[PDB]
Amino acid sequence: PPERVVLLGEFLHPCEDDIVCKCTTDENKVPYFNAPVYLENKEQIGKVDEIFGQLRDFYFSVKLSENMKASSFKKLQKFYIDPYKLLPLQRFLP
Amino acid sequence: GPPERVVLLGEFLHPCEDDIVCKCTTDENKVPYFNAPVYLENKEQIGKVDEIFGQLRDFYFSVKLSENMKASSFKKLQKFYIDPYKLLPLQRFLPRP
Amino acid sequence: MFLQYYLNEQGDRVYTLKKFDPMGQQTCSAHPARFSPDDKYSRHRITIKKRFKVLMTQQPRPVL
Amino acid sequence: MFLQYYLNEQGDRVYTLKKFDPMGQQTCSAHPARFSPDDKYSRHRITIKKRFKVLMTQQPRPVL
Amino acid sequence: WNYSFSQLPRFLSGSWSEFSTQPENFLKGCKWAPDGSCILTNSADNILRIYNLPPELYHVEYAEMVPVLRMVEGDTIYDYCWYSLMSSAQPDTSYVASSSRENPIHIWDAFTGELRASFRAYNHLDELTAAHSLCFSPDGSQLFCGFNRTVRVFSTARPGRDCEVRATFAKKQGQSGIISCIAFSPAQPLYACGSYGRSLGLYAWDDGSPLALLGGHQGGITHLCFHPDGNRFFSGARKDAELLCWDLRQSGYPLWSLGREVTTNQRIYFDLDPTGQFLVSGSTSGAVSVWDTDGKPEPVLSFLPQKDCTNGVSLHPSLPLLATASGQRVFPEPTLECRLQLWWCGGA
Amino acid sequence: TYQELLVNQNPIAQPLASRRLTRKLYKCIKKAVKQKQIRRGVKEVQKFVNKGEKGIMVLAGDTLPIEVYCHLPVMCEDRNLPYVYIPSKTDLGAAAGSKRPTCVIMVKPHEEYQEAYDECLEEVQSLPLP
Amino acid sequence: TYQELLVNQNPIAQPLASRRLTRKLYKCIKKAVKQKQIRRGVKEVQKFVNKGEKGIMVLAGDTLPIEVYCHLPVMCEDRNLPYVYIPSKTDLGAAAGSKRPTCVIMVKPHEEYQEAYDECLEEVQSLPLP
Amino acid sequence: PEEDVAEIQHAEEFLIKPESKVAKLDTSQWPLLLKNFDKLNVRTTHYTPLACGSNPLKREIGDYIRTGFINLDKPSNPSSHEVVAWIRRILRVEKTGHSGTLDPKVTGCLIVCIERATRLVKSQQSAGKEYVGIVRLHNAIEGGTQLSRALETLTGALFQRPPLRQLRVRTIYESKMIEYDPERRLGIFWVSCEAGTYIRTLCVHLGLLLGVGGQMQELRRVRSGVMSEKDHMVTMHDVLDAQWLYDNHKDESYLRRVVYPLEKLLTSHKRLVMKDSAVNAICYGAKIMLPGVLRYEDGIEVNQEIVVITTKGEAICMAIALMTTAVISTCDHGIVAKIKRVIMERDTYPRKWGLGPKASQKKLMIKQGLLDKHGKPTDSTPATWKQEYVDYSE
Amino acid sequence: KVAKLDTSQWPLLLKNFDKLNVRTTHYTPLACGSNPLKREIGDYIRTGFINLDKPSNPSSHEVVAWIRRILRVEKTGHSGTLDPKVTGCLIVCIERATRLVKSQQSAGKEYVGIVRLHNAIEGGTQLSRALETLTGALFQRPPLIAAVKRQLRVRTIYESKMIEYDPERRLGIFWVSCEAGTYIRTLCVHLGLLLGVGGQMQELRRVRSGVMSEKDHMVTMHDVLDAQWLYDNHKDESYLRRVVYPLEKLLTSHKRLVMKDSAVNAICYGAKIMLPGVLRYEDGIEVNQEIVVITTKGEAICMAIALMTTAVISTCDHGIVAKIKRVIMERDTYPRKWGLGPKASQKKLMIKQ
RNA sequence: CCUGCGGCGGCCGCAGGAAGAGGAACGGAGCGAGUCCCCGGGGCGCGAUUCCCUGAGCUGUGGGACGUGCACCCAGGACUCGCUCACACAUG
């Protein structure tokens, strides 16, 4: 269970056994691989498996936990992560 | 007399006017001496190397047969053997560096 | 292998998934022929490539 | 001897064993006339080669 | 059965149709196999043909003869012969030697007609020279063959270029010209060489040393025959009217001269009986003449096989059969078919 | 269609079979397919010709690149095998009894269909050199 | 038939005999050969023109290369000997009873064909000269 | 008339007449690094050529192969490591490398460098590359516009991960849709990208971004840096056949169509033509100083990668330019460039440093004890030498 | 009318001279040389060659002996032996042209011959395949001479072709392009072994000797005798000037290097070809390559070996462009004009002062 | 301090260097000799019995016999040790 959580990204259309999400993290900070994704109430949805797109605006797919289903999530529904599993652009950029 | 050992010289192709034409298949593409005795794997002399002809890395040779031998005796793809001292390396005939 | 091509008026490859050109004729396969290092048919390939004047040496010389 | 020839439309020798070319004309012997160093008929050959306009000096001069 | 020329020989089947394939074709002799099984014929088409002995003889009309083999050469055939010790009981003995223009001396198998061996004669420049004549030795071990100023002796057991060379002309002395025929004495250890240069030469078999040199003939000698006595022998030439009789005893000059019409540059053959009593010869006119050798040979008979040159005549070694080959070279003008024939010569 | 297939042709595809010879060859192949006498593809034909088999090698004139099968014509000439190019790759595969195109097949003789095989063989042996 | 041989003529083959004159010359050669009164080779014809033996010298107009016999026309003009060309070397050889060709023949005069000789001689000297 | 020309040739006198007009060269058709040799700025013409090397195109066959490369069309079974190992075995040569690892089932441009051309492999491996692949979508799409919009979105600097490690950044410069087939759900795409860009990963990201899912069906590399698939491209059969023809017919013709000299890879770079005496010094690891510059190209800038060449057109080394074109034209002395990678072998050209006037002066002063053993000043040095001689070690 | 002629129609080594790279256009012309076609008949023959059609009886050394009686010269050479019964292209160099014989003897030959097979083959295609087999670098035993067994050697056959075959006589015409010193008699023996039937070379004719062929400029021995006779008896050069050609015709394939008239005599004395004397130079001069050095009148001065490439010549201002291999031209054809130049004058001045 | 090569993307080890970049006659030619390389008795003419011969023997656009005479069997290249000519940067 996380101590505190910070926005991870909003819901985009689903994929085969995954949910693709557009990242809207503060200062564009990139999430770590295999990091747990949470709802607004700190209830874990899944785990981040792949991250893709341009350096400024990028997307992330979430490997769902066994209870959840990809079709259930609403349009532009927001998702969260613990702040200790985020990284700045300055590691990747130069 | 009979040599201590013999190395693969070549294999029988068609006869030609009472001597036998053979494709040369030596290791390292070595070339036989002129009038070098040709043996069968039993170390019995069948003849001597008369002509050497064809491309450098795919060459043939004719064999002038012995007194008692006949060109009809040999079968297709039958192997012939030579005293290894009576070969020369291909490098000798290739141009100087 | 699905990738095909037909040559443009400029001379460069126009890639396509179809097996015929817009002008009717067959598209060639994009990939080169299979090769194995044990191949001993260099004499054979050269011999007929000389006959039909399609050996690489007999073509017009490139611009350097 | 055995070699004959006839000229094609661009003046090249076309060698052949047959005594007649594909248009029914006789083929020439490939080999030149037999020569003697003690030949004393130089006057005579110039005399009629001039007469019939077939001496080498009367032909079109070669382009060098 | 025994030979008898008290009557004119009775006709027996011959072949004409196959020789008429080429225009202006003609036969160049005929020769029985020494066992008497078949007859060999040369022709201007350069095709040696073997005809079997007619089955209808032992079995009346006879059909036109057909050859059991045709063995093609690629150039003019100068000479040809059966193996000396041939028997049809042995496939190893039944073969035909043959020499041709700028080619090796080919050995043809007389049953299957395949090229069995090749003897090759090279000059000092290592260029192949063709033999103008052929003759096997009476043992069948060696193959003697004539060239310009030289005889070569190949060993029949080892076919190839290997040969003992025997010069007949050395420092402008000896028998000159192309040696056109060789023949061995049945009794003596010698052989006789005829040349297109007028002379005859006798030579010892083992060494090749000259025994004698004989003149006589007014043209190039074309054929030789030894009598079964061993002492007496006969010779004939091209563009020369006389067939000369010789003897090994009282040598140096021919004993008798027998007339025959020869007006071409041809090898007009002649042959003796197996017994040795009769001698038969062809002619350019066509008339086949017969002489009884047993004094001068007495004329017995003259008959005409066809209205054309009779170049070949051959007598069968056991039976009374005369074979005759016909034809000659036709000469042009600015703008009868040749044939082999057999003849029964037995008594009434 | 035969004359249209000449537009698709390969630089080395000669001697090309005529419109009628192409028809005769397909039917000889189909008969050989029923008796299972043919050999299909480069890998099999190359193996069997090297092994010692004899027959007629039918090549496809639409084949590209030429390096896939341009060694085969000389493999025939080393062993005196007759060969011939037919216009199409897709037609050869259909005649050979396969769902896809094929670049080369070798038809072997059989007592069932020697009359058709002999008509093709002698006509293919008679083909003039380019 | 005569006009076909006219294609094979040399640059120097003039004066060429007329078709009927060619036939007269062959018939004169046949009679001279029978009488043993001709010379055949360049080797021979050249030798007896040097000695100064008279006769009608007949030449083959299709002889090539011309260097073998082209000295002979002037050798005749030095000695005022009558010469003439005829269509072919094979027919000139055939006229002398030979299967092989020849490029020149010189016919000597003789009693047995003296009238035929004079008839040929008359027409040869009457020819237009180039 | 042909005969009228022939008559003039024998009658009238011919002469290459004297003229006062300026002699103007045309070097636009000269091969490789000698192309437009005339257009280079000339510092000096005074030097002594050595006659040791050769024009790159006319090296002897052994030296030609050792200093050369093949623009290979890679076949579809073997790995890239296996392909260069075959070429190493075929050409009977010691070392071989390539311009970027293609996966076993991928075909296309693979610049196989041979022996001494393997010094360029790092430069060829870092060069920009173009691909043509087929993406296989798992489910159906409305139209080809959607797959093009996905490629439009992924044009730029992207996040990527290798196939089966850390997250990596890879730029895709340009992307395009060639065509799409809705029946079999295959779409041909063309992409220009930097080196090390994972195209399998791109196909997966196109699948995720569309929503349908997808993967790479097949791939082909059409460009590798300077070389393309319409520029002298050759197959493994050609490489084998060309070597065979040289072995059995003694005919170099086919090898010289297959292999090209490494100087053909460097034709894009700006040139600095060195004096023949300075060549071997640079091969041993010297500084590229001003006394040895004969010619220098227009538009050289500071920190620019330049090719340093001989007067015969051979490449000596890749180098980093320290002076601009305008500075080289006006300065008296200094370091013009520093070595990045030495291409040419040691002792190709002879060993001719320390023979000049100023170098021999320094040697003499060290012998006289006016300078120290390591060429450094003393209290006794003249003020003329001490002021003028700008020692570059500093 | 020379002004109307395009430079492509200028004779011999001056052909296409405007497409040579121009170093400098200025020099002082001297009235010394002539164009090689206008040499005085004596000099023309002493620097000339004959493209002879060899007859079929004599040896090739007899033929060139006969040519040196006729023309009345002391030296001749002959571009590779033809055997006594062989005919065809025999380049006979006369006098000063004998300096070129190694380049002519080493050049690639072509032959048209007849092979006679000793038994029947299937057809013309079978002979055509045995010829393809004997293409490339072949083993051939050189024939025995003076009982000296020369070792097996390699000679290349560039192309082969089967022209005709006669199944009746078993004769086959072949055309062969090959390296110098190839034995065609030996080729026919091998061609016979390879077929299995056996064989011999019936006949042979050489149809090319490097630059010259039987297509053009070829003359028979009669022409050589006949042309000399016309000159001896009527004082007419015209016939000899079509039999004999100047040695420059043998050198038209080589890369050229045009020199100033000042330099010409220096090079004839054994001076190395220096860069200040070069007027023009061809594209594609490589290091250690044999080049022809010529005058502005198109006369060959020497065969030289290039020590500068084309590009190097363009960049430099002085030094050795080429060293001499063989000097063709006589000494003092041109006058001595060396030592007069600016730097050479400065050197001699500063030695004196 | 630089370069190159190899080992596991920076370091390690080994190896070659420490480099200011020279020289507008260097050190050539042409002959001759010795030694290597190269390096398939024949060729030409005339004479007399038309000198013989349309041979199935190449062959009359040539083959042979006997007299006789005649001219061929080099020229190059490389190495080595002489003689001769130069020691030449090419005249704006």
Residue numbers in the entry:
A (entry chain D): 66 to 159
B (entry chain H): 65 to 161
C (entry chain F), D (entry chain J): 1 to 64
E (entry chain K): 146 to 204, 209 to 443, 449 to 489, 510 to 522
F (entry chain E), G (entry chain I): 23 to 152
H (entry chain C): 23 to 186, 192 to 421
I (entry chain G): 43 to 395
Task: Copy text from the publication.
Human telomerase is comprised of two distinct functional lobes tethered by telomerase RNA (hTR): a catalytic core, responsible for DNA extension; and a Hinge and ACA (H/ACA) box RNP, responsible for telomerase biogenesis. The telomerase H/ACA RNP contains two H/ACA heterotetramers of dyskerin, NOP10, NHP2, and GAR1, each assembled on the 5’ and 3’ RNA hairpins of hTR. Furthermore, the telomerase H/ACA RNP also contains a Cajal body localization factor, TCAB1. The catalytic pseudouridine synthase subunit of H/ACA RNPs (Cbf5 in archaea and yeast, and dyskerin in human) converts a substrate uridine to a pseudouridine (Ψ).
Our telomerase holoenzyme sample was prepared without the addition of an RNA substrate for pseudouridylation. Therefore, we had anticipated to find the dyskerin thumb loop in an open conformation. However, focused classification revealed a subset of particles with a well-resolved thumb loop for the 3’ dyskerin (inset). Surprisingly, we observed that the 3’ dyskerin thumb loop adopts a nearly closed, or “semi-closed”, conformation, resembling the closed conformation observed in the substrate-bound archaeal complex. We observe direct interactions between the 3’ dyskerin thumb loop and an unpaired region of hTR. Nucleotide G393 of hTR flips out of the RNA duplex towards the dyskerin active site, appearing analogous to the target U nucleotide in a canonical H/ACA RNP. Compared to the archaeal structures, the thumb loop and hTR are further away from the pseudouridylation active site. Whereas, in our structure, part of the P7 stem of the hTR 3’ hairpin mimics the PS2 helix. hTR, however, lacks an analogue to the PS1 helix. On the other hand, the pseudouridylation pocket of the telomerase RNA H/ACA 5’ hairpin is highly flexible and does not appear to mimic a PS2 helix near the 5’ dyskerin like its 3’ counterpart. Together, our structure reveals that hTR acts as a pseudosubstrate at the 3’ dyskerin. The ability of hTR to mimic a substrate-bound RNA explains why we observe the 3’ dyskerin thumb loop in a semi-closed conformation rather than an open conformation.
